[PDB]
Amino acid sequence: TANIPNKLTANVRTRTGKGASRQARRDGKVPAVLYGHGTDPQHLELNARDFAAVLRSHGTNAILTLDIEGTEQLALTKALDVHPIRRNIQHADLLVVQRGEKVTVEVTVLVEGDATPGTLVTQDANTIEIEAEALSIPEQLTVSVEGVEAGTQITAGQISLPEGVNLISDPELLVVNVVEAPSAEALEEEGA
Amino acid sequence: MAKADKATAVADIAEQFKASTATVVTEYRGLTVANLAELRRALGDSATYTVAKNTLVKRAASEAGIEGLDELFAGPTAIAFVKGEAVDAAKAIKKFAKDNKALVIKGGYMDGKALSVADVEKIADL
Amino acid sequence: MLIPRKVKHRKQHHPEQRGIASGGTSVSFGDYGIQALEHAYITNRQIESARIAINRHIKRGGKVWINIFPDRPLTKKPAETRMGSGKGSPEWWVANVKPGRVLFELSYPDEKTARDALTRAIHKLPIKARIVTREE
Amino acid sequence: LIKLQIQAGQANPAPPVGPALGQHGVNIMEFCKAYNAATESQRGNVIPVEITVYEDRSFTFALKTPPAAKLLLKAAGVQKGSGEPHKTKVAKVTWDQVREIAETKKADLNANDIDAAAKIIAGTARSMGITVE
Amino acid sequence: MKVNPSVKPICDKCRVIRRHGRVMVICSDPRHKQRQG
Amino acid sequence: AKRGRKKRDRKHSKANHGKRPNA
RNA sequence: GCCCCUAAGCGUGUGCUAAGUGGAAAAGGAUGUGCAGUCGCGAAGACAACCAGGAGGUUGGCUUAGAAGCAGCCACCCUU
Ligand SMILES: [Mg+2]
Ligand SMILES: [Mg+2]
Ligand SMILES: [Mg+2]
Ligand SMILES: [Mg+2]
Ligand SMILES: [Mg+2]
Ligand SMILES: [Mg+2]
Ligand SMILES: [Mg+2]
Ligand SMILES: [Mg+2]
Ligand SMILES: [Mg+2]
Ligand SMILES: [Mg+2]
Ligand SMILES: [Mg+2]
Ligand SMILES: [Mg+2]
Ligand SMILES: [Mg+2]
Ligand SMILES: [Mg+2]
Ligand SMILES: [Mg+2]
Ligand SMILES: [Mg+2]
Ligand SMILES: [Mg+2]
Ligand SMILES: [Mg+2]
Ligand SMILES: [Zn+2]
């Protein structure tokens, strides 16, 4: 499990503020802040479209190599600001990471398969948080449900993980719950 | 159907052709699936009957010197390979065409050469 | 009919329409959801009608979550009454809905019927609404 | 040019065949007597019959092998099929009965070998929700 | 000849067209013929 | 309601700058 | 504000609009059109059009007057 850094160009922000931020967003750019253990924050602006393509390809936790005026920097997408309505990316928080470093990351969980036809599958956790090497974080985690009978609970302990990644959250976290399929009359009392 | 599937079909057709002593190219327009099942019943014991795309066989024909069969691919294409012997499928196709009357014998390939209708009819008599 | 069991004050000012939603802006329970685009009071009976519509279209499987609860009351004076003499009695319950709020959530196997049922729901609401999913 | 399913030892039922055979230009009494003789020779199972007609009102009846549904039902010992196949299992069938029915269907089907007919019968039992062992 | 603010292709045979600035639905089934008025 | 609509609509002129007395 | 009434531009450059929209209005309906962006297929021949095929098990069971691929239900396979 090895991931290659994604190449993006960054420009140091001449001016910071809300006016500057709105102008930059209008110019097809996204503002961001790069900070890390080095105790040295930098205010940058990125190309929105390239950044969005990178996120589409490699999820919300993607390793990045940034070209700050000819200097290559390794960074991780620590946080995002997505507008609720327009669903843009208003701001990015990037975390400075070096090779062979352990970081805490929230990785999404998706399910596949076909359980017993008389059952309904519900997902209670969108993501679980994991300790992993900076370049070795997994794109996503999968849980397979098939032949699952009646009330069966899948917890964070039972989920499978790649090699070299450690799960931090308590295994008691109910991720997926398989329940008996609600009957036709069962839908009429909920919400009444 | 993917282009990778087209390449796989080309490879499979080439592999089947390499093990076949002869082949017969015929026309099948106007035949029900019951008729094709009867033809398979007769041929499936020893020979092989297939129908494939014209250009897919054309690319699959570039392997050996059967590249001259391309002019027989204008119209419906039905291939008959002879895994057992060489001419049992020849009589099988000829009798099937005579009985059904909807089959036209485009030609055959034997001994490294492509032969026409009368030539194939003469060869089947051998 | 969703009615709160009890409210501390039975006569309240109108919930304010300013701003856009801050919380509950993303689907969290089910696979699919209805996101609002307009500011409105949504009553309990509109919620009931929309819920019944989803249930009838979906029939057996799947589960429906309602993230909105009508706990804010609105009052009216009795008919043909001149202005004055105190506030009227409260007689319908509403929920303050801002754009970006996710109202309903649905969990059902297939895409098409889920979208259709949600659309049947939106056709029962006094707002512009759209359908959203778990994925970004 | 029709095909029906009719009890072996019974002839002239009103709902299934009567009006069905009346509007196809087929004489019914001769067909019934010949079919009764043939299925009393068979005497074992209800049968499907295919009727081919000519321009002189001449009728030819083709009697196929007993249906896979009825053969599996009689080999498994049950009378009616499962109302919820693959959820409720009402019978169990071993490979010997499967291979007997496979030989019968080889006499009936286009399958090149007995194993193909056995797989067809296994699929038929799957539509019946009956385990094949 | 339905005359409604909302016209839709009831069955798969229905076609939606525009004639003289009006949205119309035409179909082999005469019931399904309708216009936006 | 045409009269009130027309007054409150001519509110929106270039010269009035979006406001008129009596709305 | 600048065609004439009515003082001053039927101003210049690049696009859009066919509705006299401009010169009133909602939920909602819709192959109107322009721009920008994704995904699918496609000369290894795409879509349309088009000639020929689309079979056997078998009417898969339960359900019934009836169930034959086409009340419903449940399964929903094999051969060429
Ligand atoms: Mg206030
Ligand atoms: Mg809050
Ligand atoms: Mg929230
Ligand atoms: Mg609405
Ligand atoms: Mg209507
Ligand atoms: Mg009015
Ligand atoms: Mg006012
Ligand atoms: Mg004047
Ligand atoms: Mg003048
Ligand atoms: Mg001007
Ligand atoms: Mg001019
Ligand atoms: Mg001008
Ligand atoms: Mg111009
Ligand atoms: Mg006008
Ligand atoms: Mg309008
Ligand atoms: Mg609409
Ligand atoms: Mg448009
Ligand atoms: Mg039925
Ligand atoms: Zn129609």
3-class SS of residue D3: strand
Q: Which long-range contacts (CB under 8 A, 24 or more apart) does B118-124 make?
A: B120/B24, B120/B90, B121/B94, B123/B87, B123/B90, B124/B87, B124/B90, B124/B91, B124/B94
Separation of alpha carbons B35 and D14, rounded Å: 36
Separation of alpha carbons D51 and D3, rounded Å: 6
D105's tokens: 């269907």
Strands A63-68 and A6-12: what pairing? Answer: parallel
Separation of alpha carbons A169 and A175, rounded Å: 12
| Residue C43 DSSP one-character state | E
| Element housing D106 (H / E) | helix D95-108
What's the CA D13/C1' G66 distance, rounded, in angstroms? 14
User: How many CB atoms lie under 10 A from the CB of residue B18?
Assistant: 9
Among candidates C28, C59, C99 on the partner chain, residue whose Cβ is nearest the Cβ of A184: C59
Q: Which nucleotides of G are covered by protein (CB under 7 A)?
A: 1, 19, 24, 27-32, 41-45, 51-63, 65-66, 68, 72-80
Domain range for B56:
1-126
Chain C adjacent subunits, 3+ CB pairs under 8 A: A
| Strand ranges across the sheet with C89-97 | C40-43, C89-97, C72-76
Q: Hey, what amino acid is at B20?
A: S
Q: Are A107 and A61 in contact (CB under 8 A)?
A: yes
Provide, as residue numbers in chain A, all residues whose Cβ is less than 8 Å from the Cβ of C28. 126
Place of tokens 């809905």: C97
Torsional class of F22: left (φ above 0), alpha (ψ -120 to 50), beta (otherwise): left
Buried b (16+ CB within 10 A) or exposed e, A152-187: bebebeebeeeeebebebeeebebbebeebbeeeeb
D74 and D99 share one domain = yes
Q: Are B25 and B79 in contact (CB under 8 A)?
A: yes
Closest ligand, as measured to the CA of F20 = 7
User: How many CB atoms lie under 10 A from the CB of residue D60?
Assistant: 11
DSSP calls for chain A: ---PPEEEEEEE-S--SHHHHHHHHHTTEEEEEEEETT---EEEEEEHHHHHHHHHHH-SS-EEEEEETTEEEEEEEEEEE--TTT----EEEEEE--TT-EEEEEEEEEEEEE--TTEEEEE--SEEEEEEETT---S-EEEEEES--SSEEEETTTS---TT-EE-S-TT-EEEEEEEPPPTGGGTTTT-
Separation of alpha carbons C39 and D111, rounded Å: 68
Separation of alpha carbons E15 and A149, rounded Å: 47
Residue A84 contacts C where some CB pair is shorter than 8 Å: yes
Q: Do D112 and B41 touch (CB under 8 A)?
A: yes
Backbone angles phi, psi at D15, to 5 degrees: -65, -55
Q: Are E35 and E2 in contact (CB under 8 A)?
A: yes
- Whether C contacts A, i.e. 3 or more CB pairs less than 8 A apart, is yes
D72 and D133 share one domain = yes
D46 CB below 7 A from strand G atoms: no
D114 and D126 share one domain = yes
C87–chain A nearest CA distance, Å: 30
CATH number of the domain that residue D37 is part of: 3.30.1550.10
How many CA atoms does the CB half-sphere of C128 hold within 13 Å?
6
- The residues near C98 (Cβ < 8 Å, ≥ 6 apart) are C17, C19, C20, C21, C36, C39
Separation of alpha carbons C106 and C118, rounded Å: 8
D75 and D40 share one domain = no
D51 and D87 share one domain = no
Q: Hey, what amino acid is at B9?
A: A
Q: Are E13 and E25 in contact (CB under 8 A)?
A: no
Q: Hey, what amino acid is at D32?
A: C
Residue spans per domain, chain C:
23-135
Separation of alpha carbons E28 and E32, rounded Å: 8
Q: Hey, what amino acid is at A171?
A: P
The residue among D24, D41, D64 that closes a domain is: D64
- Length of chain E, please? 37
Q: Do D112 and B37 touch (CB under 8 A)?
A: no
How many angstroms separate the alpha carbon of residue C40 from the centre of ligand 7? Answer: 21
Q: Hey, what amino acid is at D120?
A: I
Domain range for D30:
1-64
DSSP calls for C48-90: HHHHHHHHHHH-SS-EEEE-----EEEEEPPSS--S-SS--EE
B57 CB below 7 A from strand G atoms: no
What's the CA D13/C1' G73 distance, rounded, in angstroms? 27
What 3 state SS string does chain B have?
A: CCHHHHHHHHHHHHHHHHCCCCEEEEECCCCCHHHHHHHHHHHCCCCEEECCCHHHHHHHCCCCCCHHHHHHHCCCCEEEECCCCCCHHHHHHHHHHHHHCCCEEEEEEECCEEECHHHHHHHHHC
What Å resolution does this PDB entry report? 3.6
Paired residues of C128 in beta bridges = none
Separation of alpha carbons B74 and B114, rounded Å: 15
- What burial class does residue C33 get, using C-beta atoms within 10 Å of its C-beta: 0-12 exposed, 13-18 middle, 19+ buried? buried
- What burial class does residue C62 get, using C-beta atoms within 10 Å of its C-beta: 0-12 exposed, 13-18 middle, 19+ buried? buried
Superfamily covering domain C23-135:
Ribosomal protein L16/L10 (3.90.1170.10)
Q: Which of D29, D72, D70 lies closest to D47, judged by CA?
A: D70
- Nearest nucleotide by C1' from B39 CA? G80
3-class SS of residue D90: coil
B44–chain D nearest CA distance, Å: 8
Angle at A178 between CA A174 and CA A183, to 5 degrees: 135
Separation of alpha carbons D31 and D49, rounded Å: 11
Q: How far apart are the first and last CA of chain A?
A: 50
Paired residues of C133 in beta bridges = C32
Q: Hey, what amino acid is at A90?
A: Q
Chain E 1-37 residues whose Cβ is under 7 Å from strand G = 5-8, 16, 18, 21, 23, 36
The CA-atom distances, in angstroms, between D108 and each of A95, B27, B32, D66, D100 are 73, 29, 19, 9, 12
Separation of alpha carbons A168 and C12, rounded Å: 46
| Strand ranges across the sheet with A174-180 | A119-123, A174-180, A152-155
What are B's interface residues with D at a Cβ cutoff of 8 A? 37, 41, 44
The CA-atom distances, in angstroms, between C95 and each of A128, B54, C68, C126 are 33, 67, 7, 12
D62 CB below 7 A from strand G atoms: no
Place of tokens 């570039």: B62
B19 CB below 7 A from strand G atoms: no
Among candidates C20, C61, C107 on the partner chain, residue whose Cβ is nearest the Cβ of A85: C20
Residue D23 contacts B where some CB pair is shorter than 8 Å: no
How many angstroms separate the alpha carbon of residue C131 from the centre of ligand 4? Answer: 13
How many CA atoms does the CB half-sphere of C87 hold within 13 Å?
11
Separation of alpha carbons A35 and A166, rounded Å: 24
Q: Do C136 and A60 touch (CB under 8 A)?
A: yes
CATH number of the domain that residue B110 is part of: 3.30.70.1730
D97 and D46 share one domain = no
Separation of alpha carbons A68 and D68, rounded Å: 75
B9–chain D nearest CA distance, Å: 24
How many CA atoms does the CB half-sphere of B31 hold within 13 Å?
23
3-class SS of residue D111: coil
Q: Which long-range contacts (CB under 8 A, 24 or more apart) does B89-94 make?
A: B89/B22, B89/B24, B89/B43, B89/B46, B89/B47, B89/B48, B89/B49, B90/B22, B90/B24, B90/B120, B90/B123, B90/B124, B91/B124, B92/B39, B92/B42, B92/B43, B92/B47, B93/B24, B93/B26, B94/B121, B94/B124
Q: Are A47 and A29 in contact (CB under 8 A)?
A: yes
How many CA atoms does the CB half-sphere of B4 hold within 13 Å?
0
- Nearest nucleotide by C1' from D50 CA? G59
Domain count for chain D, please give it: 2
Separation of alpha carbons A88 and A160, rounded Å: 33
- Nearest nucleotide by C1' from F14 CA? G1
Backbone angles phi, psi at A103, to 5 degrees: -135, 155
Chain F adjacent subunits, 3+ CB pairs under 8 A: none
- How many Å is the Cα radius of gyration of chain E? 9
Q: Do D110 and B41 touch (CB under 8 A)?
A: yes
User: How many CB atoms lie under 10 A from the CB of residue B79?
Assistant: 20
